[PDB]
Design a binder for this molecule. Sequence first.
Ligand SMILES: N[C@H](CCC(=O)N[C@@H](CS)C(=O)NCC(=O)O)C(=O)O
Ligand SMILES: N[C@H](CCC(=O)N[C@@H](CS)C(=O)NCC(=O)O)C(=O)O
Lengths: 203, 203
Amino acid sequence: DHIKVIFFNGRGRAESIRMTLVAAGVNYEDERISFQDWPKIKPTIPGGRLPAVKITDNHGHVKWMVESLAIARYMAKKHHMMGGTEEEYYNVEKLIGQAEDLEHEYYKTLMKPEEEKQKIIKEILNGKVPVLLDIICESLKASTGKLAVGDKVTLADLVLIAVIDHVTDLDKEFLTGKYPEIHKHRENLLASSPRLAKYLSDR
Amino acid sequence: GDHIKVIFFNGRGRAESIRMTLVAAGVNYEDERISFQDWPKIKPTIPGGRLPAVKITDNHGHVKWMVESLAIARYMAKKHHMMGGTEEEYYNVEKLIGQAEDLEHEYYKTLMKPEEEKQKIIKEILNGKVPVLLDIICESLKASTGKLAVGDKVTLADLVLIAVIDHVTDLDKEFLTGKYPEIHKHRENLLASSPRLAKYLSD
Ligand SMILES: N[C@H](CCC(=O)N[C@@H](CS)C(=O)NCC(=O)O)C(=O)O
Ligand SMILES: N[C@H](CCC(=O)N[C@@H](CS)C(=O)NCC(=O)O)C(=O)O
């Protein structure tokens, strides 16, 4: 099996797929599509949207996967990162749903001109962003372990890291002196996963 | 002796997926609808401060709280064999869910806005992402190994899809008239496959 991850942006929707693969110790090839090449490549991608995952086997047969968090969930599930009980599974999904709500605020700021981007940033950072970070903080407090859910790595952990990095892309100081539980989550995570720590250090 | 209470405000909102999976599973529950007037006082009693939420009471009267609509839905669906029976069916369940939620998110752009502003946004999405997403869902449905969204039996993907199509039609009751045969065909196949849901929806 050759796994290829096809995407536009370096820390976009593909991050959860890449992080999931990295934490599982599964090898993959990154293929980044330029803004210039997209018109040509679009019709070749089932569904016409990125990110997408092209899996090619030993005999050269191709299976396609699309919808970032559907792919992420599938891989996580295969590598035991979707919780170990129905109840852990619920808590993995709760946190993902929370992180995705936060991500959606961030998305409001994306590919807009330097001007409109900063009016939206100011609106969300005084709006749903702190509300959602508080909700995530409380969710983290309720874990039975040191990570988002239980004591071992799940998709919840990886989706959370990616969304937090997005918030700090909007205001680098936003979590400075605040949300100890979030800061602590990342500490505990990089310790449970040398791979991810190594992946994230590089970029 | 679990008492399941579904707490919400809309009525055909984010709770719908929870209600529909309970209905399909033939699991009984109580609807508690929160009025605008009552929300200020009820809000601090809901963990997370957001609806919908599910309050589960045993025969002793201990409380377990569930929040995040699609985390609750997924947990219920998983418990009742509606999240696919293989890892690949599971991926396909999530793919369709992800597609439906993209559509839902366009619909949300129109909500709780004054009549005039709502008409400007409705026109934008209906000539933009809405038809693009409906075409993607149509092709997803075509790729099913059976007559429903994934395989031949009910999954969460089926219920999330019908909820989102009803939202599209709330925006323009004619939008799918003579279009998207596979979507109409899906709902047909679904009501037939689930008397309980057909009953639930007719009323
Ligand atoms: N539900 C999303 C859909 C992906 C999506 O909205 N892709 C955008 C960029 S992140 C895209 O490929 N736009 C190019 C196009 O649609 O032509 C996912 O997580 O996979
Ligand atoms: N967590 C997401 C979203 C929850 C959400 O945005 N709920 C809103 C309305 S649909 C809410 O209860 N807001 C009340 C408030 O925040 O004061 C879900 O349950 O699907």
